[PDB]
Amino acid sequence: KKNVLLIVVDQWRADFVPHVLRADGKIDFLKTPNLDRLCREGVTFRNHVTTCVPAGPARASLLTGLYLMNHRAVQNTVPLDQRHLNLGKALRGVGYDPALIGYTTTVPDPRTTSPNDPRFRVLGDLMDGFHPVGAFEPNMEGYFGWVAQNGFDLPEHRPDIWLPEGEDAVAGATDRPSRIPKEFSDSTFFTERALTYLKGRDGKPFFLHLGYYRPHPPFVASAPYHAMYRPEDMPAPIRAANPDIEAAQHPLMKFYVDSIRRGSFFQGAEGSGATLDEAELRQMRATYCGLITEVDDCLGRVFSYLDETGQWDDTLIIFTSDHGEQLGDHHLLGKIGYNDPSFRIPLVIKDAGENARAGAIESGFTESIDVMPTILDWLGGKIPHACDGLSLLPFLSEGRPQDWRTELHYEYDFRDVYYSEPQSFLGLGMNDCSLCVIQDERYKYVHFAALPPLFFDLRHDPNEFTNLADDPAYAALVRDYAQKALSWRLKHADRTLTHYRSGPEGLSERSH
Amino acid sequence: KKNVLLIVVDQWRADFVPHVLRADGKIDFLKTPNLDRLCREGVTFRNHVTTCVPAGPARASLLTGLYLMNHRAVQNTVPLDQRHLNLGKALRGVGYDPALIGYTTTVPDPRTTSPNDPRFRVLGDLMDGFHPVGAFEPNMEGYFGWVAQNGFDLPEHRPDIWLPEGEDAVAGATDRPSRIPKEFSDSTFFTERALTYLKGRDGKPFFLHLGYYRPHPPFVASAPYHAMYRPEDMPAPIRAANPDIEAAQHPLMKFYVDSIRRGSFFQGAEGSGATLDEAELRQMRATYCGLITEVDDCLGRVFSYLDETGQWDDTLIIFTSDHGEQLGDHHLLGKIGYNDPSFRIPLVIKDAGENARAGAIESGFTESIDVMPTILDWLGGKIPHACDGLSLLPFLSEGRPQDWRTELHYEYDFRDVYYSEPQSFLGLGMNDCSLCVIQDERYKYVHFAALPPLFFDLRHDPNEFTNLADDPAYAALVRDYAQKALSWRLKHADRTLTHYRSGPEGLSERSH
Amino acid sequence: KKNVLLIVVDQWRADFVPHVLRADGKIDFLKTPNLDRLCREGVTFRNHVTTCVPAGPARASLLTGLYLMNHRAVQNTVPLDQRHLNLGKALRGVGYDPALIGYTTTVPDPRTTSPNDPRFRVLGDLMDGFHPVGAFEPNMEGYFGWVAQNGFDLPEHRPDIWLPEGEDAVAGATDRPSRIPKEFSDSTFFTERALTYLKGRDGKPFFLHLGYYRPHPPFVASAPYHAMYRPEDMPAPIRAANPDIEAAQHPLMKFYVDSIRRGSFFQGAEGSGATLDEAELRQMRATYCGLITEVDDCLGRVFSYLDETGQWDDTLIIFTSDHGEQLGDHHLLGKIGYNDPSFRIPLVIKDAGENARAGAIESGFTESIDVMPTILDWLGGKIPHACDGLSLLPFLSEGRPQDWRTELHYEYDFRDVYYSEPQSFLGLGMNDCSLCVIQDERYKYVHFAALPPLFFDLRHDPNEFTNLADDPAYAALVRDYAQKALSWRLKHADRTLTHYRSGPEGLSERSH
Amino acid sequence: KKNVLLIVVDQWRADFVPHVLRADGKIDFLKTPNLDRLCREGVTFRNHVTTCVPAGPARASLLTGLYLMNHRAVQNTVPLDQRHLNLGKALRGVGYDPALIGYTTTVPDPRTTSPNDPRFRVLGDLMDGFHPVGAFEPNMEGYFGWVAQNGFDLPEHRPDIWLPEGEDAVAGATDRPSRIPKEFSDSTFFTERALTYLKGRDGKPFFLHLGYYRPHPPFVASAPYHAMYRPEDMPAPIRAANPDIEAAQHPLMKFYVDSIRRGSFFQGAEGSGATLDEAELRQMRATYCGLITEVDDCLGRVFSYLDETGQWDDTLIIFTSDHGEQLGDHHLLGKIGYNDPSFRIPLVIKDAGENARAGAIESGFTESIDVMPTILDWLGGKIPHACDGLSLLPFLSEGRPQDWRTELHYEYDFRDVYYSEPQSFLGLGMNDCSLCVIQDERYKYVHFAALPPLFFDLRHDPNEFTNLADDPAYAALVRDYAQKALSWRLKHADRTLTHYRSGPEGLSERSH
């Protein structure tokens, strides 16, 4: 039997992975023993990125194997064209039920449904082609129903379960637990769904997308996770001397430094993200780590079931996140812009049976578009023609292919959506609000469609504080990176039908 | 606020409705206090039929408002063409989430998905366009997972929970409970799903299809429902002197009398349905009533939640079944052929607020195709052009429209499917294995595509034992009924585009 | 090489076929030597019918192999659903270019094109999937352009080329030629298109739909065709003693007797069709025969090219009409209602090489739905599942299959269209304005959806003057015919997906 | 009334436009009095380019308003995805019949038709959505049929009409006429189709795509066009000292210099294009000019009809070409690679009525993608969201918009097709065989996906002989152009659905 468990957490940064911290002789300041098991048994990818943010775009890339340039689900609230083949439909093509827990944050194609469809009132709903066995549901109704049915009385505004405990609590970064017990947390919910699904399968081959919401905000944790980590033990946020000097690097930086609000990160909180002080940021980070360890605890329950039923060694397990989180870096909160911490994400893969490269940490450059092709390759399917990504399976056996990519790529589109509208500030039209990034071990280039470009020397400036793009002494380098990214664009134009040929012998296909 | 609760039970006969029994001065030999509440508050339809059987075809009609002649999902295991507009998609068109609990038994259109799709391994899966919030799942995996997660240990073959209690139990009609406790029954499962969904909604307007599996077989009940009714208190089965004399009426009757097996009705049972004796049939009926009262008990929990939250008077509640059940009538078990008990089904409708016709029992002839138009009319939508059914709303206020139908209609297709293959016995090709029925208070005509027709005088022969179709003295009557059914065929040809017109002023539509 | 020439004339009656007239010892009062060649070399079908009228519906049946009950292009100006597979697309499936001359009178599916599409201003345009190589074009623009480019000056209203010659001419049935020379006639036009297409092919395998407009009205002929036949030599029209006694048979008869206008049949004419006298009707018939012989002359040019290039013996030639013409019968002009002369049409088929049944006249009952399956069978394709018709090829070799149909069937829908609106007169809604007909050598039954039925004894009443349906002594017969037609309905329900099955081994198909 | 005549010639270079030659004080060495009329009455665009070559890709751009990056019809023989809205369908959306003469060289989408479709045996057939009124047809069957029907006897291999006259003629560049009389030329054919269509319209509003094949090769002309121009009077070809020094600039240059054959340009000719001597090249150019003047003569007939019927002042006339022709430049023949002469094309536009800018010559940078939006804007339609081009109408009135593009762009894909397969030579995979170009008055940058880039200083090196891209002193410039092209890529990502938004008020659209 072959099973696939695709664990997709939300908003979990690549530098919050203990196996890699320990590899580099850093303090592993959070605990994730179950993720650590996967790392010991599998391959940990240390230069993995999501190809776009935030959740909608990122999950479109993950679940289609396409760049944002191809999928066009460019922001939350923007439709995903039905024409793209997604992992759910592809899994049906190899005889697998595409069972899904969590959410995909997918807006339907308006050509396919009524303009009155309630799916158009929310950020996104379930992507067509999956089989939902544990949905969050829009407005988290699935979760809240489950809490209510478990007999826990909810407040009148149900997200107020995430206010810190106590009538006197000040909303924001907090050393108080949330107002929801651990047993009724969202992470418990998703886990119970997983266990229910796996028990229903009763040994039959499975695919399961196991989605967790955490550590997405609000940054508040059920007891005792809220108190598990000390703020002084957390890595310091990396940021310029003040928000104004930060914002000076680029107009998009300025937009987000100015506009991000604390209430988008802590339930009920007032004020700007940028004005959080170091102590507050450290508490936030400790809470974030609490959330992370709550997921890991829950994963241990899923893993225990696989072990007890003798399915662990038959399961390909992929752990990843949809995207990262600034976590105060550069005066930002969230997953926006162009900085590494918004895009870099974990990826750990444990093959079936004893893995050839168990415990290895891979520096080859991998992108979230690669995960769908990997899964399909593993299950013996054809990788669709149209995918931009490649299978990672060679990494599990012999290593990085000679001809593998030599740069990481990602994209961000910041056109106006109902809750964040930078266009007027920036002076831009809707189709001119994007950027792409290309990077390697040495240099990072950020190319904006209609704003200035950025270029960082990552050996000297690993935290991206010193734009060099407009320095004449760097002209040849910036040229070279603009040129690599331009080649990337041309190599990734849509491939739907481009292998077909008419000719004297009729319709054919080209394979090379 | 306007809500819709569409309760769809499975295999529940119209003559197992206490309100109607009492109206006709019969003993109401089963208890259904919650259904009785709906009857007291709403309109009970006493001449309602499903337009086809079994579950797949019936639910296609229910959920599209189409005859089988139009929907073509002619048997279980036969695809439903994606072109038909179903209630789920139509509900999205009026801004409602099409939440569904239970199942639809729908085989996908092969033009829309891979031939490898696991949905093609089972009878049917969920119909496209619904939002599942409590699926049985193929092979009842949803249920069995929920049982397992609740900590109940299941047997190795999970349907063996429906063997009668005790190692010594003889499989078949039984006075022993099943091996599943009430708290872990399927009806409990669907109810918990309903309550979870409604609690998640938290007062917001809803549509919910609340599906129950019971009283579908196996005819075994959790304690103490197995013992709730005495076999001597049940209505006697209505059948000919012996199976051979029964089978003589028609070749299709003979097919089913000969082939139906007890193991399709009682878990693990051996032998033919037809050879059950009167005592066995009475026990089966008592068990069936047990199952029915277990549903009604569960409905009381859903209704209690609506009452406690003040939503009862804002909810249109429709109770119906997908089809009926022979229950030993005519030596048959199941939902097959042409007899009234396979097609006649409950229908009770309680409008929002104090109903103008509360407690009324309606004799107007209504068909399951009418339910979708009723729901959409009630929610202020347009009834799609293509529907064969009409809205029932006039019945809730002034009564039967002057121009309402004056005959009931239904259809059955018996072409070969993997578990029941009458073609070779009958001598027929696949496109020649159907019948249609037309009836009124006086006469019933059964027209077969390629076998002999049947005609019953229902005043003299209410139980359809004496075919008159080949009696010359009935030629004018049979003529008249063949002619009504033929007019019916012509009046119901597909209406997808037939209202459109080209002409000098361009494209238009005709409304009358 | 295998070629197919499908010649489709318009409005040509089956009883205007000399080979059959001579077979029955009648005077062959018109000349058609080229059609007579096909008859001598092939099989002439004497009981062929179009399954519906007028041109749009008839050509939908011809070009899809579907009954009107399935195709739903129920009247002129009503869309043809894109879902039906037509002969053009099927021909592409066997590697043939679906070249077409003439017209198909097809209204596009509004779901496929803008509501502003100019194709919605006319009766119909070209059916999707054909390759036009000689279109009439809407409003006959293709023709009129060709005339103008040939240097003939057209009148200001271009159809006035069909006024009889002379300023003093009275419009109507005429012994004067039209105002267009033979060399610039429509039949010359289509022929020149054919020859141009065949010369372009230069021996390569072809399919060609060679459409002629004639003998469709206006009943006026280029010289000397207008004078070729004497009115006294024509068959007398068959009609009741006066229009009122005619109209009494049925309300639909009354509608058409009352409403048909002469200007729909003769350019510029005033007055009712019904009031034409016997002399006028005889002239009309002589003109009609003139038109027919002009087509036959033109066919001789196409046939001469096939002969000179050695392709005759490699070509399957099918000659047929879209429908017939009342030609004064029953006080009617046109193709309407239920009478034999509107539906009965020629069919002659000459196979490649020396035909086994050369010169034979076939009485087996054949329908226009059979022609598409015949063509595809001949070219080695699969007959689509969805076709209602069957291949005629067995008739060319061994004869009528044992299991061939034993009745002829056709349909007419008379719902309101911009130029003919019987609904208010009849008292009917749009979906209640149809009939179907079933007949054999002895009896004819006409079943109306919502009007009275008709039944004729064809041995005693070959011209359908004496309705017997309401005669009690005929109850068993009418019963029997209503019953055959009802079986026909059930046997012909849509077959798109009904051969597919889910089951344990996955998706399969049933072949029998 | 508003009419549109879109004249699309084939293979006509921008520097073969007399009005522009005379404007720049050059000898106008060819005569085109009818094109000159349009120039005197309208606006001549002197910096117009096709966005890709050869014919298939170019006509996809022209007829969709999309870059090659979006349409993906990347080479001849590669399918055009049905999802793109083309001008034919858009014209139906404004109530215009999309009449077309010539050809579109469009390979159908294989998801839409059988793999056996004969349209897959040729380079391309007619694009879906047009109404053909004068097709060349695959293999020019339409033309050759018309010749044959006109009574001209064709040779056994019909393209041998383009061998030079005389049994002794050497195939290649020639001072002999072709073997087809002027009256039976292809340009006469298209013209007769136009006149036939316009006469059929009889004053009603029209759209007509009037396609000419000439001056596409074979470079041989009917008498006396073959002798109309002296070889010594032609502009000299611009090329390096020898083919090897030419080929050294870039591997793609080398491919084409090496592989192009004379038989692709002159009927029956042997040998390489590159080895033609100056005299031969001059003759070729004189023949090419002959072909051009034959088109112009034919246009005068169409224009005469518009004048005689009083429609000239009601017609928007757009004259353009699908692409250019190297004509010996850079040792090349054809439309390949990256040089200006393959991409630069005429564009002249005469508005209805007396034009505000009659006689003006516009230097604003315009691209073939702009033509569809112009036509639709002119006819009062919405420009589709998805178009990459913009309407040119502002140029006809006030001039170049302030915010108009400041660079020209084009693309070439050279992946393997049946007749030209550079991949193995180049060492490339199929999705790595493309380039894009960006240019302005001063500099030209050619960016290859997987080969070296090129950069020209057009003031010093107008004929693109000196690549500077690898010169360090040009690093900042090449950077700047790579960066403009990269911004171009990002600004032109697919726009199908990217204006839609979900949100609290339901589905909406963003306009800015």
PDB file of C-alpha atoms in Angstrom, chain A residues 267-391:
ATOM      1  CA  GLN A 267      -7.798  39.716  18.735  1.00  0.00           C
ATOM      2  CA  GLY A 268      -9.288  43.096  19.614  1.00  0.00           C
ATOM      3  CA  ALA A 269      -5.925  44.939  19.608  1.00  0.00           C
ATOM      4  CA  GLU A 270      -5.485  48.588  18.654  1.00  0.00           C
ATOM      5  CA  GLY A 271      -2.592  50.405  17.080  1.00  0.00           C
ATOM      6  CA  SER A 272       0.107  49.820  14.503  1.00  0.00           C
ATOM      7  CA  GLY A 273       2.176  46.649  14.092  1.00  0.00           C
ATOM      8  CA  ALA A 274       5.260  48.785  13.540  1.00  0.00           C
ATOM      9  CA  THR A 275       5.190  50.393  16.971  1.00  0.00           C
ATOM     10  CA  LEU A 276       5.422  47.130  18.949  1.00  0.00           C
ATOM     11  CA  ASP A 277       8.441  47.224  21.230  1.00  0.00           C
ATOM     12  CA  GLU A 278      11.053  44.594  21.605  1.00  0.00           C
ATOM     13  CA  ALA A 279       9.444  43.056  24.716  1.00  0.00           C
ATOM     14  CA  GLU A 280       6.049  42.863  22.976  1.00  0.00           C
ATOM     15  CA  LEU A 281       7.647  41.309  19.902  1.00  0.00           C
ATOM     16  CA  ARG A 282       9.412  38.778  22.084  1.00  0.00           C
ATOM     17  CA  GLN A 283       6.178  37.819  23.824  1.00  0.00           C
ATOM     18  CA  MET A 284       4.490  37.472  20.397  1.00  0.00           C
ATOM     19  CA  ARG A 285       7.256  35.169  19.363  1.00  0.00           C
ATOM     20  CA  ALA A 286       6.927  33.067  22.486  1.00  0.00           C
ATOM     21  CA  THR A 287       3.158  32.762  21.874  1.00  0.00           C
ATOM     22  CA  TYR A 288       3.864  31.805  18.276  1.00  0.00           C
ATOM     23  CA  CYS A 289       6.189  29.110  19.461  1.00  0.00           C
ATOM     24  CA  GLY A 290       3.379  27.886  21.862  1.00  0.00           C
ATOM     25  CA  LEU A 291       1.080  27.551  18.897  1.00  0.00           C
ATOM     26  CA  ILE A 292       3.691  25.652  17.015  1.00  0.00           C
ATOM     27  CA  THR A 293       4.259  23.157  19.765  1.00  0.00           C
ATOM     28  CA  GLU A 294       0.459  22.631  20.059  1.00  0.00           C
ATOM     29  CA  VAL A 295       0.479  21.586  16.408  1.00  0.00           C
ATOM     30  CA  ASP A 296       3.390  19.324  16.930  1.00  0.00           C
ATOM     31  CA  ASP A 297       1.643  17.715  19.936  1.00  0.00           C
ATOM     32  CA  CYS A 298      -1.393  17.136  17.743  1.00  0.00           C
ATOM     33  CA  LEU A 299       0.727  15.680  14.944  1.00  0.00           C
ATOM     34  CA  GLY A 300       2.039  13.146  17.492  1.00  0.00           C
ATOM     35  CA  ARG A 301      -1.509  11.822  17.777  1.00  0.00           C
ATOM     36  CA  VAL A 302      -1.845  11.333  14.057  1.00  0.00           C
ATOM     37  CA  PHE A 303       1.584   9.755  13.914  1.00  0.00           C
ATOM     38  CA  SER A 304       0.705   7.458  16.818  1.00  0.00           C
ATOM     39  CA  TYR A 305      -2.291   6.140  14.882  1.00  0.00           C
ATOM     40  CA  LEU A 306      -0.154   5.481  11.814  1.00  0.00           C
ATOM     41  CA  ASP A 307       2.357   3.649  14.011  1.00  0.00           C
ATOM     42  CA  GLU A 308      -0.271   1.537  15.846  1.00  0.00           C
ATOM     43  CA  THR A 309      -1.823   0.429  12.565  1.00  0.00           C
ATOM     44  CA  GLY A 310       1.488  -0.331  10.891  1.00  0.00           C
ATOM     45  CA  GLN A 311       1.112   2.324   8.175  1.00  0.00           C
ATOM     46  CA  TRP A 312       4.033   4.622   8.953  1.00  0.00           C
ATOM     47  CA  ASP A 313       6.456   2.800   6.664  1.00  0.00           C
ATOM     48  CA  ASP A 314       3.910   2.804   3.853  1.00  0.00           C
ATOM     49  CA  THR A 315       3.284   6.546   4.001  1.00  0.00           C
ATOM     50  CA  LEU A 316       4.996   9.381   2.171  1.00  0.00           C
ATOM     51  CA  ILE A 317       4.778  12.257   4.694  1.00  0.00           C
ATOM     52  CA  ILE A 318       5.357  15.816   3.476  1.00  0.00           C
ATOM     53  CA  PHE A 319       5.350  18.622   6.048  1.00  0.00           C
ATOM     54  CA  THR A 320       5.257  22.186   4.818  1.00  0.00           C
ATOM     55  CA  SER A 321       3.640  25.564   5.317  1.00  0.00           C
ATOM     56  CA  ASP A 322       1.689  27.764   2.847  1.00  0.00           C
ATOM     57  CA  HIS A 323       4.014  30.688   3.618  1.00  0.00           C
ATOM     58  CA  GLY A 324       6.029  32.344   6.355  1.00  0.00           C
ATOM     59  CA  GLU A 325       5.577  35.347   8.629  1.00  0.00           C
ATOM     60  CA  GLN A 326       7.587  38.517   9.196  1.00  0.00           C
ATOM     61  CA  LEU A 327       7.083  38.248  12.996  1.00  0.00           C
ATOM     62  CA  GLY A 328       8.330  41.780  13.488  1.00  0.00           C
ATOM     63  CA  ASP A 329      11.168  41.588  11.017  1.00  0.00           C
ATOM     64  CA  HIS A 330      11.481  44.845   9.189  1.00  0.00           C
ATOM     65  CA  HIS A 331       8.798  46.376  11.330  1.00  0.00           C
ATOM     66  CA  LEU A 332       6.279  44.095   9.608  1.00  0.00           C
ATOM     67  CA  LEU A 333       3.757  41.486  10.744  1.00  0.00           C
ATOM     68  CA  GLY A 334       2.269  39.073   8.258  1.00  0.00           C
ATOM     69  CA  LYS A 335       3.147  37.693   4.861  1.00  0.00           C
ATOM     70  CA  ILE A 336       3.619  40.530   2.445  1.00  0.00           C
ATOM     71  CA  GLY A 337       6.247  42.179   0.265  1.00  0.00           C
ATOM     72  CA  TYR A 338       9.560  40.732  -0.697  1.00  0.00           C
ATOM     73  CA  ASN A 339      11.543  39.764   2.438  1.00  0.00           C
ATOM     74  CA  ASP A 340      12.865  36.193   2.921  1.00  0.00           C
ATOM     75  CA  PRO A 341      10.858  35.524   6.169  1.00  0.00           C
ATOM     76  CA  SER A 342       7.517  35.883   4.395  1.00  0.00           C
ATOM     77  CA  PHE A 343       8.526  33.243   1.700  1.00  0.00           C
ATOM     78  CA  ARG A 344      10.923  30.790   3.263  1.00  0.00           C
ATOM     79  CA  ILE A 345       9.007  27.783   4.628  1.00  0.00           C
ATOM     80  CA  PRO A 346       9.729  24.305   6.077  1.00  0.00           C
ATOM     81  CA  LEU A 347       9.734  21.259   3.933  1.00  0.00           C
ATOM     82  CA  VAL A 348      10.444  17.802   5.278  1.00  0.00           C
ATOM     83  CA  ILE A 349       9.794  14.655   3.369  1.00  0.00           C
ATOM     84  CA  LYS A 350       9.794  11.112   4.705  1.00  0.00           C
ATOM     85  CA  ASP A 351       9.554   8.436   2.088  1.00  0.00           C
ATOM     86  CA  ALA A 352       8.045   4.970   2.655  1.00  0.00           C
ATOM     87  CA  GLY A 353      10.435   2.478   4.259  1.00  0.00           C
ATOM     88  CA  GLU A 354      13.959   3.206   5.502  1.00  0.00           C
ATOM     89  CA  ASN A 355      14.945   6.456   3.734  1.00  0.00           C
ATOM     90  CA  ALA A 356      18.291   6.523   1.817  1.00  0.00           C
ATOM     91  CA  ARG A 357      19.021  10.000   3.023  1.00  0.00           C
ATOM     92  CA  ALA A 358      17.445   9.868   6.499  1.00  0.00           C
ATOM     93  CA  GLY A 359      18.504  12.914   8.525  1.00  0.00           C
ATOM     94  CA  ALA A 360      19.966  14.793   5.562  1.00  0.00           C
ATOM     95  CA  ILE A 361      19.567  18.498   5.158  1.00  0.00           C
ATOM     96  CA  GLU A 362      19.274  19.622   1.540  1.00  0.00           C
ATOM     97  CA  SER A 363      20.459  23.030   0.329  1.00  0.00           C
ATOM     98  CA  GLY A 364      19.168  22.676  -3.235  1.00  0.00           C
ATOM     99  CA  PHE A 365      16.699  25.372  -4.036  1.00  0.00           C
ATOM    100  CA  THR A 366      13.089  24.121  -3.859  1.00  0.00           C
ATOM    101  CA  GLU A 367       9.802  25.803  -4.469  1.00  0.00           C
ATOM    102  CA  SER A 368       6.235  24.987  -3.391  1.00  0.00           C
ATOM    103  CA  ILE A 369       5.353  24.271  -7.024  1.00  0.00           C
ATOM    104  CA  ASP A 370       7.465  21.144  -6.764  1.00  0.00           C
ATOM    105  CA  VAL A 371       5.213  19.408  -4.193  1.00  0.00           C
ATOM    106  CA  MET A 372       2.343  18.449  -6.510  1.00  0.00           C
ATOM    107  CA  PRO A 373       4.675  16.930  -9.093  1.00  0.00           C
ATOM    108  CA  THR A 374       6.428  15.037  -6.286  1.00  0.00           C
ATOM    109  CA  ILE A 375       3.206  13.557  -4.990  1.00  0.00           C
ATOM    110  CA  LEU A 376       1.994  12.537  -8.436  1.00  0.00           C
ATOM    111  CA  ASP A 377       5.379  11.104  -9.415  1.00  0.00           C
ATOM    112  CA  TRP A 378       5.396   9.088  -6.211  1.00  0.00           C
ATOM    113  CA  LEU A 379       1.960   7.622  -6.890  1.00  0.00           C
ATOM    114  CA  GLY A 380       3.006   6.641 -10.426  1.00  0.00           C
ATOM    115  CA  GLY A 381       1.151   9.374 -12.268  1.00  0.00           C
ATOM    116  CA  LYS A 382       2.314  11.513 -15.124  1.00  0.00           C
ATOM    117  CA  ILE A 383       3.306  15.025 -14.034  1.00  0.00           C
ATOM    118  CA  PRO A 384       0.923  17.278 -15.954  1.00  0.00           C
ATOM    119  CA  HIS A 385       2.499  19.160 -18.887  1.00  0.00           C
ATOM    120  CA  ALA A 386       1.359  22.490 -17.545  1.00  0.00           C
ATOM    121  CA  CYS A 387       3.168  22.279 -14.132  1.00  0.00           C
ATOM    122  CA  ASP A 388       5.993  24.714 -13.509  1.00  0.00           C
ATOM    123  CA  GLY A 389       7.428  22.582 -10.688  1.00  0.00           C
ATOM    124  CA  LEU A 390       9.470  19.377 -10.827  1.00  0.00           C
ATOM    125  CA  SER A 391       9.415  16.221  -8.766  1.00  0.00           C
TER     126      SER A 391
END
